[PDB]
Amino acid sequence: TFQCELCSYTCPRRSNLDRHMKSHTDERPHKCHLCGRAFRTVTLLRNHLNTHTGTRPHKCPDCDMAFVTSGELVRHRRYKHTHEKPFKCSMCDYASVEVSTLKRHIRSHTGERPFQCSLCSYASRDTYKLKRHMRTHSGEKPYECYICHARFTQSGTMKMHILQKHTENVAKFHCPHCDTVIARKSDLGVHLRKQHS
DNA sequence: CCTCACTAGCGCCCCCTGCTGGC
DNA sequence: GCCAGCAGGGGGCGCTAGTGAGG
Ligand SMILES: [Zn+2]
Ligand SMILES: [Zn+2]
Ligand SMILES: [Zn+2]
Ligand SMILES: [Zn+2]
Ligand SMILES: [Zn+2]
Ligand SMILES: [Zn+2]
Ligand SMILES: [Zn+2]
């Protein structure tokens, strides 16, 4: 197996060996003229231009969605149609379509928190969770109620706001031990832990 | 072969749940 | 109790860089 030996990639085929030699250290000749980003191959530039125009030739045969590359169509079919989850956890029955999703799941088993907040002692298991946590320090409220124009730090909080304040005839919770009506299920949980041990 | 598949990976934002503490 | 704040385990897509067998 003739190999590059630089990173020691083993290649049974021939043309794939010379193609890998161009990925160790090569410039980016194919330059996009809209933005300032350049690419190595014509196909990478053609796909980049499709993202500029929204051209999606790979159409899903099971739904209306379409994608730029064939890989995005394959991953979509595993999420919404075939439900094929190739990456499985060795500690439980969990499985995911992508590797990083499984690694995020494994960190729930191990408790690894590698993303430390730079302003407090908090650390999260995911990059997004740290960014959502930063709103506590910045006071940012990105989500706005489309009815009363009230702002919230999370989208789920906004949806609960619309349910509890703008939705009519919402089924409320009744305490099984006393005649107390409670709107939110979690507030029923607090009431049960206070006046009922 | 140079085009399309499949893989590997980063990046990003939504979902739902359930608790907390000021009011 | 009402309420927004806030952290937890999750689904799913956007986009790029390599790779693998191919009419
Ligand atoms: Zn190599
Ligand atoms: Zn561009
Ligand atoms: Zn589909
Ligand atoms: Zn697991
Ligand atoms: Zn912090
Ligand atoms: Zn509102
Ligand atoms: Zn009660």
Name the experiment that determined this structure: X-ray
Pair A119, A137: CB distance under 8 Å? yes
Between CA A116 and CA A4 the distance in angstroms is 39
What is the spatial distance, in angstroms and rounded to an integer, between the CA atom of A160 and the C1' atom of B16?
11
Characterize the bridge pairing of strands A151-152 and A95-96: unpaired
Q: Specify if A132 maps to a domain.
A: no
| Integer Cα distance of A20 and A11 in angstroms | 9
Tell me which residue range forms the domain holding A28: 15-39
Say which residue the tokens 């509890």 belong to: A164
- Residue A23: inside a domain: yes
Q: Distance (Å, rounded) from C-alpha A119 to C-alpha A137?
A: 8
Which neighbouring-strand residues pair with A173? Answer: A182
Nucleotide nearest to A23 (CA to C1'): C18
d(CA A191, CA A108): 30
> Token pair of A119, please?
């302003």
Do the domain assignments include residue A173? no
Calculated CA dihedral for residues A87, A89, A95, A97, nearest 10 degrees: -30
**Number of other CB atoms surrounding residue A102 within 10 Å:** 19
- CA–CA separation, A195 vs A197, rounded Å? 6
Pairing of β A58-59 and β A38-39: unpaired
Q: Give me the resolution in angstroms, 1 decimal.
A: 2.2
Q: How far is the CA of A116 from the C1' of B20 (A)?
A: 22
Paired tokens of A5: 């030996």
Residues, CB-to-ion distance under 5 Å, ligand 1? A 4, 6-7, 9
Any domain includes A25: yes
Please tell me what DSSP assigns to residue A59: E
DSSP symbols for A143-168: EE-TTT--EESSHHHHHHHHHHHH-S
Task: Give chain A's domain count.
Answer: 1
Q: What is the Cα–Cα distance from A39 to A177, expressed in whole angstroms?
A: 68
Place of tokens 């349910």: A163
- What DSSP state is assigned to residue A40? S
Q: Return the residue matching tokens 């996009």.
A: A32
Residue A29: inside a domain: yes
Give a yes or no: residue A30 inside a domain: yes
Given a contact cutoff of 8 angstroms between Cβ atoms, the answer to whether A94 and A102 are in contact is yes
Is there a domain that residue A24 lies in?
yes
A120-135: buried (b, 16+ CB within 10 Å) or exposed (e) per residue?
Answer: eebebbeeeebeebee
Cα–chain center distance at A162:
25
CA of A8 to the centre of ligand 1 (A): 5
Distance, CA of A136 to C1' of B21, in Å: 15
Which single residue is written with the structure tokens 């408790």?
A111
In a domain, A28, yes or no: yes
User: How does A36-45 read in b/e, with b if 16+ C-beta sit within 10 Å?
Assistant: eeebeeeeeb
Residue lying closest to nucleotide B15, CA to C1': A156
Q: Where are the beta strands (DSSP E) in A22-138?
A: 30-31, 38-39, 58-59, 66-67, 87-88, 95-96, 115-116, 123-124
A49: nearest Cα among A36, A32, A65, A66: A32
Distance from residue A160's CA to nucleotide B15's C1', rounded to whole Å: 13
A156 CA distance to ligand 7 centroid (A)?
27
